[model samples]
Target: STIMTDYNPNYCFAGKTSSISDLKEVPRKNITLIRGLGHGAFGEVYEGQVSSPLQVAVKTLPEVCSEQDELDFLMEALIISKFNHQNIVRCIGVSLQSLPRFILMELMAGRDLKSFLRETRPRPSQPSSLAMLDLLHVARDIACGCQYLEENHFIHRDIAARNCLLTCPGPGRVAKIGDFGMARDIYRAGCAMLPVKWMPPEAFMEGIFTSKTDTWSFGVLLWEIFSLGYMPYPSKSNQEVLEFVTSGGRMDPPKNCPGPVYRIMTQCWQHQPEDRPNFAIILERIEYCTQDPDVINTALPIEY
Candidate 1:
């Protein structure tokens, strides 16, 4: 672990006016590295701080990755940095170096929806239907973020529960969308593909990535939210997730999920990608489900 001293050099910040070359070391008293946050394939995330007591999440990537990949990641950060929505994580600044790269972002103190559901000590299901309503609020917040991205012609390749952050900005605070590792501009077409679990059938088998692909991921996330923290495909492996979907294994919505909402999920997972509704429509439907009096109330506090 790296220690921060008053004179350590590599720290820069947003909301501050300075060039990267002019940045000085963050004061030691203001810096601390939190452990067990988590790690991804390309980087690790830690909790840290700068001149003030305010905390932040810092993501660091090794230099061994291709310049192109790093550039792509930086590009995603840059694009997201331009927006200042409450539902999107704020990019504070970045530390560029030849050996490694670091990105500093506003710290959101909440577990990823996945851990919130499945991994938490007590699980989030204890809150009742009212809690589920809160979860939906978080999902709606994320939908707003995605809507913003899509309006800007960007498609978030990954849209799972694990990438979302739950926060209590106030009595009815919304969940903020975090992580942009696989986000891409709609104009910058790519042949690469993502893991099969959250992918639509057409996308998993073919290199068909688009705004609609994100809708499919959103549908899976909806199911994840309703399952009391069950991992998607908990009964199968990656290969099985692929083979099953490829062989007509339609993704069924969680049994407990509202029928209308489940129908929407099924629409998103339709074999024909074009058949999927746009995020705008999806958002409207989600709102309808949450407000509908016929279905089980989903507004209970976070128990599951």
Candidate 2:
């Protein structure tokens, strides 16, 4: 890895030729576009079927996309291809040999965790399908992926329920972390440009970012899950959240949040970045809570 003007969450492809060349190149003729899922890091993603009979996601460059777009498109592929864990999204191959360049990945059948949480939130007339144990499973699943990223020297700056896509729609659904370093959606502060509410003090208040900042975001994602996908500090602007957090203000756990589960959330928000537990440790703690039936039965209110 050669030195380049790269910062946290932005990769420097200064000398990695093989990384690009090594992409699993799939032929365009082999894929059948089923439908659009949504846009990915830099391109439109589709629910696609391969002749191999595998359901895959196709990330295709827009018709008017420039070289930089292609670069970013390839960069995301390179990033995802590094993952081998079940909790993380895996790259299948790319179709760069034709008019429409494509980056293929494992299809996440369900929506992002945010949408799922909000949609399936507990209701008075209907029993909620999402349980506390399921959310804990979601938390641990994300923790499992974050652990892999930290161990590999990758920092996913944006770790939220929105970025964790579910593999299917059910209690047994597997949540997989997606949209690597280049998450497209964001917020704007006075002069800041990042996912505002999920940020750490070191990031917004001091402009410091590292793998640890991802933990801070990951912690907030835990809060988001427990709250059944409500936006954090929805009433405050980005700067307010920044000031509030730097001034030692923090959010209280949701009324229904499990005690130990919320404990991990607080630990992740430690003023000093070094004080936070590693994802491996977070995963370890979450695993113990999985035994309680509330972890699998209880859920947040649809109204609250």
Candidate 3:
């Protein structure tokens, strides 16, 4: 897919002051790989320590690719590196001097939201679980991050629990959005296959991607948060999901999902992309929900 390179230099954040050549090459000796974190379509992520004592996550890409593809990869990294938000992952630097290219980022101590939710859900042996307020905070944090992106005219094609990371454990844990593998500038025009379950109807029908399309995915991420890490549309295949959504079907609210929270999620899944609430409005709604005394004090049990 072709991306628009007409982005403003100021928006590049880290790239604005540095040339592509300067950002591409980092000293290999500065980073010491500790252990593998996970794998992605492009490469594996690992925990590593840079020259400083702070630990960071290192994402590696294939050594060989078309020069255009390499430039695209670097551009995406540059865009991410410039983002300065509490809820967005911070890119420390990149290393393209060797066969396995590396993109170093802040290491999330609590790991991704997917694993956090899975472990926090109530089981027979573990009755105590994540509180309702904490979950709402996580949702709010993600919205705040996405709102920043929207203001900057960026689109995060992928927004799910899997892509959100937790900084620490417990009630005050911080959730930040990560994984820019599919993110793009809003003005860019291109077509790429998206995750069906998380995608809005227009995305599948017209191949259109915008902040509103991302808003649609954010709705699904809310469902994931409330569902305690269960896969969206667990009984449906991707094709089935596509057909069901096109037919005006939506996922039932997770068991015991609060009415206000469920309402926000539905707004995000509006059929017309323009009808969906933007991140700012969503953030406002979430803030209102947090203000509710019941929601703030509730410790709803996970029914799994």
Candidate 4:
């Protein structure tokens, strides 16, 4: 492995990280490339096997990359390593010993939730594998993940079905959020690079971001999941989205979206950030979306 010099001051990841060399530096020899999975925000991602034949998804940055790119990549890796939650993607290790540096994370065979949703969209010829209850579970798991983040004083900044992954899109599937925070500088402000569709009014208009902003995105994610990964604000321009959202506009609930879940989505989209439910409440709110009596008939009686 190559050495990482003085980046402690430059690339700190929230308060959760304390040391400069906090991450596990895996030697290059231990990582065996299986195949290219796809492109990551920084570089090509591969399905690799780290030591013990453990499967991993490796995000690589080649020697040809600029210092800025390397810094951003490591920021993403470091930020992820600090988080410990079932619904958040776990960072396995980083192979920074040599050129073509690698950031390794657990591999989710089903890829991102968006791709999985569109691929398995309900059709007359092919029934979608996951039912409504399963979709609600996916929603609950993401809320659980965000709740943990909020509790730890971090806002994901971007939350979307596209940013989350499915272990496998059928029974036993668990959605894990990934692509933590905007580690890149170019997307900061006064630019078209930001994800406006997911941005809350305060963020897109006043440049204010908090957990409440994430709450807005979570609402959009709910819409995407229920709509089988359809883009939020469907066919609306980025400028148009900003106008509509700032003017108290919100999209209709996805076809067949449960009333309770839709209500939760509306709460997430409250115009005033103070009115939005923090993720703890969001997580609690999700529990009922699936627990409604008619959807699943069980004999569990009410507690005293």
Candidate 5:
């Protein structure tokens, strides 16, 4: 059932309100680790089943986690419990009875966006290609999820292709935003080394992170999507990227990226944080682009 019912008064987390559901604690005995999913910044994830039936993603912290690590893990569980949206990943509960605490979440069958794009890329034997409409839909879904967060005054600092998860394979797959370890409330301020390649100039120069910074990362994410998971600024190092952006450099549109989509990306990359359009506006622009009949008919080329 619920954990921290009346105890741990200082356990409150950012983006948390009194009305939100109490953090849940699943019985550790009910969970069975199936396979390794991937490693995260602070822990490892595994495919697990609860009570022998329900499948879930279980994130486990290190056995020797520090105080900050415990706080981060609890914070992630708290933040995720407050979210209830189709485009956002769902958290089932957590196992904190002993060492190596686990955070259980909805299992995404199609895997993450980065790997999906790589797998779907045209190959010599299969020649399969993603339709333009599919790409637009995936982008739109991510925007929808981010828009929800923006509306709720939350900033997902790590918005990227790698963090977006798909429900299943094939055209028009549903995408959900995951990995909330770096997420924070719009009202809070902190200094941390963000993912340099995905960060906005403001975050780089001043350590100021806001909703606008998330917008900036979304722009880079679009670049990754259109390029079929290409790393941002492939030819430049982190230091070079910092210098280049400070000198007014921006990524060029990926080859074959639609004009309307590219326009949105440019808007998201505006030098001024306030100049970047909010997620609502971004989502609207993306939906407008998807209205074109050609976007639905065209097939992505074999070569990205």
Candidate 6:
């Protein structure tokens, strides 16, 4: 089933032709504006309903983006809408009217992986087996999503804890990779401004980006998961982290992380992009660790 309603060629939508200022809420009585969810550079997200039984996430865009930007956004939205996978967050629909455009997607409840881990850290001794399982499951799901992207000639440049969303289907532990805002079609060869520490050394130093870079970011994400949402280089400022990473300071996974997992992390951080294993290989290793949670508990391959 398609996520968006039938397209209307006559109407200029906010995500495509119209600006953010041109948008106004669709004033349908049945549409309940639940509450504000989150916000990004483009606009804010809200929990709302359209016709009966439709619970959706509404992304409103700013007016500064041009019609071309809206058009590109819609095209990307369409691609995302058609992407159907259990591990990937589903896009529901989108509405365009005047300046502000709204992209509606499935309402995923639960904190993002980053926030979830940070909140759970206060009780250090209270280990959560379920949360660990959830992380493994999420890693598998993201692998599945990455497989789909590869098959479709698309690359998700940014793969971090912030982009992953948790859902209740897997008891709120299953992870679904979301936020295609930085994704690009492989054939298009698009350039993007990327965050430094998460970026691969090659991409950061020489401006070379590819699917491999995404996989490198995934390695950093794995570190985040193992450390319970620890950001890379806590002592270093954002610029310092960027500079350090670019200057050959690779990630050193926490002491508690399993040896195999730590090896996987370093393998991903290899200077040559081709040296890194594909997502499928990483998925298998992670799945193996999931089958044996104790490995993650005691193994400290690369000491911090």
Query: Best candidate per TM-score, number?
Result: 4
* Candidate 1 error regions (>4 Å): 1-36, 63-73, 97-100, 119-130, 168-173, 184-193, 296-304
Q: Which digits, one per residue and each the tens of the lDDT, describe model 3 over residues 1-304?
A: 1221332222344235534445545588888899987786666789999883768899877666655555556666776777878899888888766657788888998898999998878766766667677889999999999998888777788898988999887667889998876664331223335578999987888878888988999999999998888899989988899999999899898867888899999999999988999998999999999999866665566455
Per-residue accuracy of model 2 over 262-292 as CA lDDT, tens digit each: 8889999999989988888888888878876
Model 1 alpha-carbon miss at residue 31, Å: 5.5
Candidate 4, 1-304: lDDT as tens digits? 2223655433443454443378798888988998987785558889999875889998888677765665666667667887789999889999876668888988998899999887776665555355677778889889998888788767778898878988875688899997774633522224586889998899987888888988999999989988878899989999999999989999998876767878988999999999999988888878876778653332211112
Report residue 104 deviation for candidate 3 (angstroms).
Answer: 0.6
For each candidate, give its TM-score against the true structure. Answer: 0.76, 0.87, 0.87, 0.90, 0.89, 0.78
State which candidate, 2 or 6, has the greater TM-score. Answer: 2
Question: What is the C-alpha lDDT profile of model 1 across 1-304, one tens digit per residue?
Answer: 1211222322112333222334232344444567647887667788877553667787777656654555555555555455668888887766654235566678876657676555432334433323546556666788888777666656677888878876643345557778766653332233334557888876667667788888888878877777655778778988888888887676666645667767877877877778888889888987987787654453322433
Clashing residue pairs in candidate 3 (N, C-alpha, C atoms within 3 angstroms): none
lDDT (10s digit) by residue, model 6, range 133-194: 55566677777777666655556778888888777533645677778776523212323445
Backbone clash pairs for candidate 5 read none
Model 3 alpha-carbon drift over 4 Å, by segment? 1-19, 22-25, 64-69, 184-193, 297-299, 302-304
* Residue-pair clashes, model 1: 16
lDDT values, one for every candidate: 0.65, 0.77, 0.80, 0.79, 0.80, 0.66
List the lowest-lDDT window of 10 residues for candidate 2: 1-10
Model 5, which residues run further than 4 Å from truth?
Answer: 1-21, 184-193
Could you tell me the lDDT of residue 128 within candidate 3? 68
Per-residue alpha-carbon lDDT of model 5 for 1-304, expressed as tens digits? 1233333323233444532246687888888999997797668899999984889999898877655555556667777887889999999888877557888999999899999988887666566557677788889999999988888877788899988999888755799997776663321223335578898888889878888998999999999988888899989988899999888899997767877788888899999999999998998888888898755555566753
Could you tell me the lDDT of residue 240 within candidate 3?
Answer: 92
Local error of candidate 4 at 235, Å? 1.0
